[PDB]
Structures are given as C-alpha cells and as structure tokens.
TrEMBL record, chains A, B, C, D, E, F:
Pfam family, one: PIG-L
Name of this protein: PIG-L family deacetylase
Residues where Zn(2+) binds: 40, 43, 151
Binding, Ca(2+): 193, 265
Length: 267, 267, 267, 267, 267, 267
C-alpha cells in the first residue's frame, strides 16, 4: 500500500484525505453529546462559551467535567478556600444555565493540586465510559508559556483518558461493573495557539461575557477592567483568521497524529 | 579563548567544529555496541528497524531495553494484559531475530504506568554501566503532539540516564559492586520532527515492515490498512530530506547542547 | 471595552501598552530587592552574573535561592557527594562576594532529585513572602532541548511560586505566623532562547568569568577548555541582538501572558 | 444517658449488649452476599476456604476481590511474572469452583507492589457500592510479625473502604453515575491472632486442602511438605479454642471499636 | 557510670528517677502554653476537652492545630464537603470558646487524605518553632485497632515533629527566616489504651459534652444515642484507674523512650 | 501429614522441631558472612557492637549496609548536614575498625527521609545478591513506641528484601547482569523487646562503648551522661534474661513465621 505515491506531499494528502478521512469543514456537525473538560470553574465559559451555546442551541447535550474546586481563586484573607469553592459551584451552575448546559461532574481535586496520575485518568475514563460522548473538548496542553499545572495536566490527562477509555485492560473494574469501553469520535483542544477550526461567535459575544461574569468571585469590576480587553483581544485573534469579528479557536487532529507523527504540525 | 571571533555565527561554527568536534557525516561509523531503548515492544522496529538491520549487518552488537510490557495493547475484552504481555515478548523475540538483535532487557514496567523517577534512571544506568555501549538510541521526548506519557518519559529518562551513568555518586551501589561509571559516545533520538541525520533504508523497507508485522497482536490486518500507509508516509518524510525514497531520521547533537544552550535548535 | 479596535494587531498593541502598561525599555530600573533562583550552585553566575554585578553596583539588594546542593557534580570516584556539597557552598559564597550578593538561601534538595511538588512551592513562597522582592529571576523552563530536570523544575516552580505567593489560601500557615501575601512586580527568565531584553555586559565579562571560575570543583582547567568557548559563544548570541559584544538575555512578559494567552509568543 | 451504671465493667457490658447490639453467637447467620478480599490468589482458600464452602452451601453468594496478580510467586528463573499471573488466574478459577464461588474481581495491582492509597480505596468502594454485600472478609492487618506489605495494606484498605463506602463525598463520581453509598453489616478479619468467632471446619478440611492445592504453581509437592503441617497446625490452633479438631478463626467487632476505642482488646 | 547497680530493676528505676528525672505526679504543672493537635475538628474536645478546660482555667494558653478540614464527615448526599468544612470550622470555634481556647491553626489537608510526609512535618515544626510551646498533645498512634489513617498519621507526625523541631538542619529555611529550633518539654498522648496519667474530669463532664455537641454536624440526636454512652464508657474506663467517676487518660514518657528502648512498656 | 498429633501444643512443637528444624541453641554458629543493616551511622555499634566483635573474632566477615547519611544528627546551627554526613562517615570507619568490620555500603538516603519503597528494596536485594550473606541483622520494626520512621522502615525493608532476593522476577535486571537470586539462611532482629537469643557481652562491654563513642559528633560528654546509663540499663535488661551481667538480644524466627502465622508470638 502507498507504493504509488511519489512525494511526501502526495502521501501526506492521501493519508489525511483517504486513509484517515480527516476534514475540518464542520468537525462538530454529527455530535449528539459532548463533554467539555475544564481545569477550574469558569474555563469552559472562557475558552469556549460561545461554541457551547451554539451546540446547546442545536440540541447537542453538553456536559462539563470540572477537574478542580477553584479553592485558591481569591486574594481576600478573610475568604476560606472552602467557602470559595461552595460559592464557585453556584457560579458555575448559573453560568452553565446561561449556556444551555445541564450536567456538571465535579472531580473535586483541590485547585493548584490536580495530580498527574493514573488515578485521575480513571475518573475521566469512568465518566467517558458512562456517558459515551461523541466529542471531548479540553485545553491544549502545549499552549506556549502556559504556567498553570492544573491547565497543562487537564489537557494531557483528557487526551490520554480519551485514548485509554477504549482499552478493556485499563481500569478493568469498570468493565466488570458494566461500563464498557468507549471510542470518542473527536477531541477538540481549546485555549490553543495553533487552531485549525474557528467558530464565529460574533453574535454571541455578549452572552459569552455574561456567562463569564456570572463567576462573580473571580471577575470583580476591577479585574474585569483587564479581562474584558483580554477576552476581546483573544476572540479577535481567532475571528481574524476566518475574516469575522469574534471567534473561538480549536485544534482538531486525526487520533493517529497524537502519537509518533513527525509532521503533526502540518495541520 | 574565543576572543578573536567577531560574530555569533563565527563563534557558533568554531564551537561546533573545533571545540565539540561535531560532525553529522557518519555519526554511527565507529560503533561497536549500541543500545536501543523502546517504550513498548515494537518501537525499535517501527522507529528504526531499517537502521538496526544495517547496524547488525555491519557487525554492530545491538541490544534493546524495553521499558514496559505492552500490557494495555489490546481492545479484545477476553485477552488479559498478562497474556498479552507474554504474547508480546515472543513477538519481539521474533522481530529482533529478523533485525539481527540478540539481547533484550525487559524492565517490565506496566504499559501506561512507566514512572518518571530516579528508580527508573537507576535501572537504565545499571544496564549502561554493565554493557558500556558506544551509542544509545531513544525517542525524541520533544516530538510535537506526542501524547503517550510512556514515550515522553522514555526519551527524557534515556537522555538523563546517559548523562548520569558518568557520575560515581549517582546510583553509587553500582560502583560498590563493580559497575564502574561509563561515558557513552553518542545519543541519537528517533521518532523526531527535527532530524539532522537520515539513513536510507529504501532497500530494507520490506524487511522493516516484516519485522513490524511480527508484532501480530498489535498489527492485525484491519489495523495494517492504516499503519502501512502511515509508515510509508513517515519513511518518505525522512527519505525526501536526503533525496531517497525511504529514510529513518535521527537527531544527534553534541552533549553540551542538551543543557543551557540557547541555540541548540540551529542544528 | 475594546469595542472600538478593528484589527487583532490594534487590540494587541492596546492591550500591551495601555491595559498591561508593559514596556521592555528598562524593566529593572525600579528594583530595590531581587531574588535570583538557581537550580545548582553556579547557575546565577553563569546565567546572569554580569547583570547581578550591575544590579548590586546600583544598590539593588540581590539574594539567591539555590534549589539544590550540587551533590552530583563530580566524576571523581574518591569525592563523596557530601564533601562536594560542602565544597560548593564555599565556592558559591566566594562567587557571590565577587558579584555583590550577600545572602543565599539553600533549600538543600539533593542535585538530580529536586521534586516538582507543592512542598517545594511552599519553600519558595515562604522566602518570597519574608523578603518581599520586587523582581524574581529564574531559568526559562521552556528552553529547547533542556534535559536537566532540576533546571526545568526550577523554572516552572519559580513562576508558579511567584503567582501563588499572592494567594492567602496557598500555604496558609505563613499568613497565620505573620508572613503576609506578597505580589512581585516582575519575573525575568534567564537561560532563554527567546530573550526580549538584553543587558550589555561587555565591560563585565572578565569579572563574570572570574565569578564562574570561583566554582573550582566544576571548572577544572580541562573543562574550561570547552566552557570558556561556550560561555563566550552564548554571550555573543545575546549581545549581537542589541549590537554589542557580550550580552545577557532575559525574557520578560506581562503576568497575564503566563496563562491562557495564545499570542504570548508575539513578544 | 449511661448515668446509672457505676463501674466500667457495667458500662462496657451495657454498651456492647444494648447500645451496639453486638454478639458473636452466629455473626454470619443473616448474610446473603459477602465479599472475601484476598491479597494474592489463594489467600481466601488458605485463610477461610472451609467457611467459604459452608457459606456457599447455605445459599450465600460469595464474591472475591483479589488485590494483586501473584506475579512474584515463583523461584523458577524461566517463568516470567506475566506467565505466572495468567496461570494463577486459572488456578483461582478452579479453586473457587470447588468452594462454590462464582465471581472474582481482579484489581491487577502487581504482587509486592499493592499501593496504600486513596486510589485503591476507590477501587474497593466502587465494588462494595455495586455489589452491596452484607459482609466483608479481609486479613487482619494487625497480625503480629506479618511481614508482607500486600497483606497489611489489604487489611487496612478493606477496613477503611468499608467505612468510606457509606460517605457520599468519598469517591463522589460513583454517586454521580448511579452507585449509591452502601453500609456493610459486618466485617470479619481472617489470618488473625485474636479471633473471637471460630467456625468448625473438621469435616471440610480435605476439601479445603484440595482447594488450596489447586494453586499448583504455589504448592509443589516439595513446598507442600512444609505447608500441610503448617495449615493443619493453624486449623488446630483455631479449632482447639472451641473444642473441635479443625477451625477457622475470625475477629469481629462493632464498627465503633475500629476507632478511638481504648478497650477494643477486651473482645 | 551505672556500674554499681546490680539488677535491671535497679538500673531501670535509677535511669527514670535520676538520669531522666521522670515523674508522673503532675506532668502539666509548669505549662504556660500547650498545643493540642487533632486529626479532625472535634477530636481535642472528645479526647481531652475536660483537661483543656482545666488547663485554660489555670491560665495555660491552649492552642489547637487541626490537621484536616473534616470534609468527609457527612452521610447527606446533598451536603458538599466544601460546605461541611465551612460548617465545621464554625463548630470548632464555638466548641473552643467553651473550653477557653483562643487560637486554632488549620492545616486544611482534606479529611481521609492527610499525608504521611516530610511536608506535613514541616507545617507542624513551623508552628512549634513560632509558638514555642511547653507541651504538645496528640493521639497515641499505637492505639490498638485504630483504623483511621488520619488518626494514626497525626500521632506519628506529631511525635516526629516535636523531635525534629530541635534540629536546625530540619526545615532549615525556618531558621533562615528567624524561626529558631525549639525543644518542647513534654508530649502527652490522648486516645490511649496505655495511659499512665489520668485527669479527674468528673465535675466538668457536662461542659465537655456540651463542647462536643457544639459539633452539631457530627452529633445529631440519632448519633448521640450511641455516642453519649460511648463517651461515658470511655471516661469511666479512665476514671476507674484512679478511683474517680470520670477521667481523661494520657500517656507520658521520657523523650528517650520513644526510640530504641526495649522496656518502654514498663511505664 | 500432621494427622496423628492431637493437640495444638503437640503440633506446634513438631512443626518447629521437625518440619522447620528451628533451634535457638547457637543460631550464628555456621555463619561465614553476615550483613548488619543500620538506619544511621552508629546503630550497628549501639544495637549489637559486642556481637559484631565476637563474630569478627571467630573469622565471620561482617559487612554493614547503612541506609542513611546521618545528616540531621546535630543541634549546632553552624554545622551543615553535608559536613555532618562527611564527619559521620569517618566516625563509622573508625568504629567499624574497632569491631573488625572491613566493608560498609552507604545507601546515602538522607536521614529522616528514608523512603519506604520498592526502590530501596532493590538497593538491599542488589547487595544481598552480590554478597550472598548467610545472615542478615536489622532492627525489629515492631519495637514498641519506636518513633523514628528511618528505624521502622529499615526493619521492614530488610525483612522484605531478604524474602524478595530469592525471587527472580523481583528486580529482574539483577539476574540479567549476572546477580543471581540468593537465599539467606537467617535473619536476626536487634533493638528488640522480644528477644529469644541473647549473646553475653560482659567482657566486651568496654570495647562496645569505645566503638560507640567513636561517633563523637553524636556522643558529646554531655549527651554521654545520659547515654552511658541508658546503654548499660539496656545491656542489663538483656543479660539478666540469661543470668549474665551484660547481653545483646536478638529475635530469630523460622522464615515461615514472618507471614500469616497466628502463633508467632509463642517463640
Ligand atoms: Cl494490501
Ligand atoms: Cl489496499
Ligand atoms: Cl505540570
Ligand atoms: Cl469602568
Ligand atoms: Cl587559555
Ligand atoms: Cl587555548
Ligand atoms: Cl509524561
Ligand atoms: Cl487489503
Ligand atoms: Cl466599562
Ligand atoms: Cl473603561
Ligand atoms: Cl522535569
Ligand atoms: Cl590552555
Ligand atoms: Cl437522652
Ligand atoms: Cl435514652
Ligand atoms: Cl505496609
Ligand atoms: Cl511425601
Ligand atoms: Cl563519668
Ligand atoms: Cl558521673
Ligand atoms: Cl496510616
Ligand atoms: Cl432520647
Ligand atoms: Cl504425604
Ligand atoms: Cl510425609
Ligand atoms: Cl514509618
Ligand atoms: Cl562526668
């Protein structure tokens, strides 16, 4: 096979088009149920809140997994992390209602303390096998200069957990209690410097910002003086790539390209 | 020293040529004994099987270290990981016989569970100090989008273990039982986006694919319909860089450049 | 806000100039007290010794944190790591005296064994909250091909510990014993491939080299035959970027850009 | 309450009889489903195989959890751990069929490597919440001079996991996927120096020994020359306490006595 | 020395009386400031609430360290651990006010997740060196059948941390920031099966029980129907050893006897 | 087998005399090479220095394994742990010379930081398999009130490592580099409350105390005012059990009794 192509460029295009059937025309078109994985309460709204409302409005069931409890998100010396986590849970329930999301799984690892371990893969794999989502969204763990370990670990653990949910010897007691292996159809990484699919969110921008500001403990007015400019600059970064005012960017690749593929950066 | 050069380009070339005596003409020419480090059974054959056969055919002694047992490599709900691991040991013995390899060290860490720790360094440094190889091959841990932790950890632990095998206070009980410090002459990284040395394997391609397919548990005919196209695409990516049909790529650098070198990407 | 810009370029420049007030003109001008974090004894003098002497000579109080004891830095089978660590403490005290540094905190983690953990963050945040430095310097953990885990871990732990030092629920017993949250004004990363600020050290080069050679155990004459060429080639790399003979490079970014910022590589 | 008793002996007897309703007349009489937790394949048969057969013969459904794979159980240099594990799985299925057991959960931690961690607790609580057993058996982790960490860790993790299975904030994703909190009705510890309940197994001793010897890889004839005398000495130790030839001993206590009870050794 | 005694009994008594100056007449008589270390909110009140009130009433400053947040203490599926932990902080402040305690350090490790590690030692040693207490109370980690890892770990970590607070190379950054080594004068273990000092609390029993029931989330009326009988049975167990109605028991030993002492059980 | 004994006492005596061939008459009589494992430098001399000199004088080759470097053993704020450790290595070489010991393996784990892990077992098993000792001595990890984690961990790791050195799948790279499995003939535990074999050291007491005081950094004259009385009180405790002035005690048991043996405290 692949004996009659003559150049690498020809093989490459034939591998993507024919063998992997990859395309970026509308990667989310067939989804019925997706899971959006966030490191902290508010990252699904920040990274992809317009696209979550577009999906919910088309009748896609969007479920969150939140990896941590947001305990550390305050500079108030009188607000304990326990009290903040309870406040953030209610904030995310109000944000998610605005975006059409009706189910959140809380892993409850402490903020700044998310482990990078098989145990946390097992939590993700248990929920993937229970819910059988078509798509999974998570942060791109290769974002340049990303300095928060919870973000880098969420992205790597989500990619690994999507792969290992298909393997019956990984977390085998799930198979023994009736949670069968599941093969997700696509992963999409948000918070990405290298998007290859952009969703125009220009007419949902105000709704997105409203869903973000529902995390009131995080976005005081003072903080918003910097964050609204930031968030509009990011959405213009994405939207300008497809000639629209505001966009949300995602990186999607064939499953093969997440492993031993030396030209994965050509898409 | 280095006071008479005038530009960074001049200093850089003098550092590589004269001080480090670095050359990519024939980096494997003097090797008598090399160790090829693979994350899982079948990675030496996939990443570099053509070059392993060339080296064996020249009378180089090629030894494998396999970091993990391949336990997780099945989607059959009836095949336990213990039985798969036993099957894969036999597959690698048959693959290795085709490529001229006569010695495999099995570290037996569980697949998907290779630790990143001093303990696993010590296992690599014990074998390096026992066998005194001239060269060590391992995956490039900086391959973009590599999402298997066993692969990233094998590359980093091999680079570190080659450096630490020279240090008598590292794993000092080896020195006390007669395994002296050893200084490897070169490292070469396979599975790389940034090769700087390519071996033409055009006339060994069918043998490389045979050696790969000897891992029958991983390469069923259905899976091969994707994997032969992929493997030929990858070998054309490398071969095209030197104007040949099929190549295997390696990244080789002076030892110095694996540490505090801000222009290491200029080779 | 940010509704009247019409291109990403416009928004980006307005976000950096107006909202973040970021400028690379003289990022160190207002500093009264800085901490320089080194993985091993000698890294502050190698990565940034000229700039340390410039800062001391302006009356800046420069403090080191050394993460590890340098135990493993010998190929002499007769010198224990314990004896080497004692030797290296004295070498660093001599080197530091040459550069105007009068205080070093020794975390005493063993060389090649620095953990990547909350416990080590807590050590950094205790010292940052006690000393209240204006600036913190550390290695850039994203230097390409950096293969020493103690270097990568120092960079990431330093950036995370600057951020978490401002959070009263992080390491809360410090607040309870009277070490209040502290907000550092800038971070600067040395050992970097992507500097955006270069200090001319041409007239302090011989003093820098003297301060490095004070670490006699590391820089024997034989080793210096390779290391003087290396260090001059690095200083030319940096100095050529601003048209001077010898430079030390730093990467400085707005705090926001260390997290979720897809265009952080544009500075 | 408890204001009218006037001696500790009076209060103790009232607390056990009235408040805790504790007795040891026939602690297993009401059981419909029990789980027997073994560190390695063959420990349920060795510690309590006669009682398992009594229970199965009364219509009790007896389920095993085996914590490890038995990988390390050979002194044959030609038998890999992987092959041993596969052999021991078949040995246990044969042993279990002799004793009436029809379901085994295999956690598959490697022998000599069982962790003592929240992750292993979560595997035990998942199975306890799925199966809702009335009783759980495990080794007594306080057996004097017990030197195998897998045995000590299995006893502690079993006791902890029975308590934590009732707590909806412990391993909360189970509650989210439909596995509700479960309250086991008794624990019984085997392999105990301090039994307080003994089962007469005099007429099932030959069956018990057959079930043990079905683990042929462990009990070669040579090893059996020591192990039959050992096993009969232990069963006489227990049976002599109740005036019978062969017994199996268990320690049962009120749940309260597993925590902050300074007279728990008085039963 | 000790050459003129003739029997072990003679030597033993002379070691305790003359060399170690040990006695148990009134071990708390000279204390001005004590720390009571509890695993969870409510353990100081349960283990030793009468004695805490006796000490405060004498003008001793009693300070708590609470190792964990009590997150897991509920069987209500509607109450999150975060909310529980906030509730229990308030409960403890009310309980402590009743007993005369005015300061509590909260380590905030999650309940059922307290580590056994150098990091937690370092938190105890920072507080011991800041507060310089004369006495420290903690659970006896050798209580038979104690099945809660947080209780066993608190007792061992407290004993260890008392010893290591005297050592300037342990947690050396405390010494560098001005927290000098401290030598506690006594440890007293509560929750013990082997008390050697009993405090009569007969006239403070109703106050102790009030301070316990202030932890309303733990002691609902239904649970109290078992817990008041238990608590009265325990206090009778201790008081009967000194011929009083209700007592609290402590185990106190010379520092030497916590290490390499084969007759430590003779006191 | 064992069908003709009628009582447990009969079976027990026959199991020990005939099947296990257990004798406490002269357990060390056949030894040619023993390893004495100490947690810190000085514990072999303190726990068993008289016996080590008896054994050396009979021509037994006594080798030490010291698990830690003694870093923490000082209350001088000017003496670093690095310097202490180097001083203590020389102290031990002088002490060991007095006792006839000519070889010490230093594992160099930091004092107070000995792990309890497979990695440290592998260090012990590599030395056991290299040296093939007839006997191994270690602390009894079940000594009551032993509060130093390095002592408890040394005892358990030594017992485990003796057992696992016989198993070719444990630390299998040893067998691959030519270190075959080894079966030690006896373990003897020192620092024990339950000795069953006592060596009379009455005429070697002053030599033992000289070998202890050779650890000058630990035994200043001030400290010795407590430690001489302690050490003579301990040797009297042991010697009185066999009617001699000064003894060293050991606990020896058949290998079988270290596992699943409910009457192991009957010897
Ligand atoms: Cl075909
Ligand atoms: Cl085809
Ligand atoms: Cl990370
Ligand atoms: Cl405004
Ligand atoms: Cl020169
Ligand atoms: Cl020269
Ligand atoms: Cl990784
Ligand atoms: Cl085909
Ligand atoms: Cl505004
Ligand atoms: Cl505004
Ligand atoms: Cl790292
Ligand atoms: Cl020269
Ligand atoms: Cl009542
Ligand atoms: Cl009542
Ligand atoms: Cl254990
Ligand atoms: Cl026979
Ligand atoms: Cl004297
Ligand atoms: Cl005297
Ligand atoms: Cl524990
Ligand atoms: Cl009532
Ligand atoms: Cl027979
Ligand atoms: Cl026989
Ligand atoms: Cl321990
Ligand atoms: Cl004197």
């Amino acid at each position: 096979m692949f004996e009659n192509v003559s150049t690498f460029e020809e093989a490459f295009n034939k591998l993507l088009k024919e063998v992997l059937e990859f395309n970026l025309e509308n990667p989310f078109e067939d989804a019925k149920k997706v899971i959006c994985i966030e490191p902290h309460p508010d990252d699904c709204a920040i990274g992809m809140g317009g696209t979550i409302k577009k999906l919910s409005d088309e009748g896609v069931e969007v479920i969150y997994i939140c990896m941590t409890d947001g305990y550390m998100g305050t500079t108030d010396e009188k607000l304990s992390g326990h009290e903040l986590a309870l406040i953030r849970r209610r904030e995310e329930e109000e944000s998610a209602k605005l975006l059409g999301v009706r189910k959140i799984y809380w892993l409850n690892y402490r903020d700044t303390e998310l482990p990078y371990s098989r145990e946390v893969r097992k939590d993700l794999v248990k929920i993937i096998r229970k819910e059988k989502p078509d798509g999974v969204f998570a942060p791109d763990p290769w974002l340049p200069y990303e300095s928060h370990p919870d973000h880098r670990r969420t992205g790597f653990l989500a990619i690994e957990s999507v792969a290992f949910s298909q393997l019956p010897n990984f977390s085998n007691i799930d198979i023994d209690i009736g949670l069968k292996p599941h093969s997700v159809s696509f992963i999409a990484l948000y918070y990405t410097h290298k998007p290859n699919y952009i969703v125009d969110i220009t007419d949902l921008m105000e709704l997105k910002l409203k869903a973000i500001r529902a995390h009131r403990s995080q976005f005081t007015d003072d903080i918003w003086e910097t964050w609204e400019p930031f968030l509009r600059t990011v959405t213009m970064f994405y939207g300008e790539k497809i000639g629209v005012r505001y966009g949300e960017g995602f990186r999607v690749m064939p499953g093969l390209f997440y492993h031993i593929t030396p030209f994965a950066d050509l898409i």
